[PDB]
Amino acid sequence: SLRECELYVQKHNIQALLKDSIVQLCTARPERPMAFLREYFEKLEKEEAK
Template sequence: MATSSSPNLEEDESLKGCEVFVQKHNIQQILKECIVNLCIAKPERPMKFLREHFEKLEKEESQQILARQKSNSQSDSHDDEVSPPLPNPVVKARRRRGGVSAEVYTEEDAVSYVRKVIPKDYKTMTALAKAISKNVLFAHLDDNER
């Protein structure tokens, strides 16, 4: 069981890293604005429009970086003028649910979860096995998982 939880932990860490990256660089808002602009303009060549849009954003970003560097070099010479640091975006931790209407559970709950096995008689087991064998959703299960 430890081998199956290890990839899940790595996947969770990778997902958290992606979420932090998206938050840090404001990717979601940028893409939202891009799609809105695309829908408003409705260009004949959407890829060209998107490329030009992102090139424009890149130029604006580089101008902002240059302006910040310029102001930093000026503030180094003027110790009296101190600019306030830019506020960092608040990263909200996602809380997981077992299902759509299930209650939220934590990682500790997931690690300590004990699967409930309900004993079944032979007739019920054969009926379930027959139904599962015909269902595409359960085709990948091995004998222990069925």
């Protein structure tokens, strides 16, 4: 029952967020992961305009 529900959050929903996520945690040096996610997309959101 919980598997079919996860069919939406595959590589099309949280992927755009997890993509850069691991790219930063790959170094395994999260001085603060609890707050990292907060400032992670907070600043990444205002990435200027192409």
